[PDB]
Ligand binder design. Structure first.
Ligand SMILES: [Zn+2]
Ligand SMILES: [Zn+2]
Lengths: 229, 229
């Protein structure tokens, strides 16, 4: 059906997504004569990328790429915020029949590149260590994103043709947070002078800036030098 | 004073942090004979890293590094979740008197490496394009983190000695979100069978999994192939 559905669990403050991408998948695999395991990896990257593309806050494109020292040294899917997808895989050898994700890629990484329509490019990387792509990607999110995130990816055949789908769950940012408010806190915070920040006690810096707002302060943490003597 | 303070704006659901890091800064600059602009860059990276280290959800360390083709080809600060900091800068030439961030580093990048005590390493990168480090880092966050984030960094001298400080604002993850709940949604979501996901209509997949929860569904998005014919 090739559609991605967005939904919100009102009571848990968690968003979810579901995508089945299979007419798109066929156009991506079409006339490349990819062996089977390669076909599956791409079907999986396709779902992953489509699910991530939907979480984008700004217009731009995202690429989720696998590269390594294995028979399949490259697999990539690139998608934009309009859900237009494309990709390829490069093979250079020994693809065993029941290739593993680790077997296909070998020693490698999962590289995610986010290019905003406006601004500049960002790229993030984690070693490929999970057994599954969904698992590798959750490793990436766990280290790079505060909001807990889960990915579920399925692939198989339907009507003898390739088909795949997947779902995502991500904690939402607090309801309370208004955009104009956050911006106000920031503008306010920027009125801090170097001298005030560097010479006055912490509490005073805080009431001088935020006495109008309700603020809970926690126990401070000593910052110290990491010695080698 | 070398302490980092955490606080929460109860009504806006935004967390904030404030750090002054100046006895630590002296131990980092001590006996390296760094020119002035280099001293400042490191004071700035020190505050940035200390502010980020506090946002860590798990134990581990974080490094914020600048590398480029300028007189100061390398500057790094590494900190752990216990706020122990360390670092260096490598100079290889022409540091003009009033060196720019762009002047010092030249053409380069901001590289952030997050190494969990347990798991594996993650690294993210953006080109160095902002005029200030705080600005470069906000570029990084804008592309890699859903939760809006702002950084304020100040450096100067106090008692003739080097001193620096900074503050952070970050939207919090929704209050509603319980950990055990998110986990329940996930376990539930994982009971989806490939065949159900790939053969059944989207709505049915959703009520079969989530009929007990209150769920708002939004208009689907067509996923399509990006053509070149
Ligand atoms: Zn020492
Ligand atoms: Zn075409």
């Amino acid at each position: 059906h090739d559609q991605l559905h967005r939904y919100l669990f009102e009571n848990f403050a968690v968003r979810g997504e579901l995508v089945t991408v299979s007419e798109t998948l066929q156009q991506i695999l079409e006339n490349h004569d990819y062996p089977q395991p390669v076909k599956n990896v791409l079907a999986e990257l396709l779902v992953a990328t489509s699910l991530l593309t939907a979480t984008l806050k700004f217009d731009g494109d995202i690429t989720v790429q696998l590269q390594g020292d294995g028979p399949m040294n490259l697999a990539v899917i690139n998608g934009n915020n309009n859900q237009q997808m494309r990709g390829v895989a490069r093979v250079q050898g020994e693809i065993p029949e029941n290739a593993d994700l680790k077997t296909l890629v070998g020693n490698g990484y999962v590289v995610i590149t986010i290019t905003p329509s406006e601004g500049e490019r960002y790229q993030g990387v984690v070693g490929l260590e999970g057994d599954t792509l969904a698992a590798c990607l959750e490793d990436y999110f766990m280290r790079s994103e505060q909001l807990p995130t889960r990915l579920f990816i399925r692939t198989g055949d339907v009507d003898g043709k390739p088909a795949a789908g997947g779902m995502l769950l991500q904690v939402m940012p607090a309801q309370n947070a208004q955009q104009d408010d956050f911006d106000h806190l920031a503008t306010l915070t920027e009125t801090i002078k170097t001298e005030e920040l560097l010479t006055l006690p912490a509490n005073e810096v805080l009431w001088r800036l935020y006495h109008e707002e309700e603020v809970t302060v926690y126990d401070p943490q000593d910052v110290e030098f990491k010695c080698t003597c």
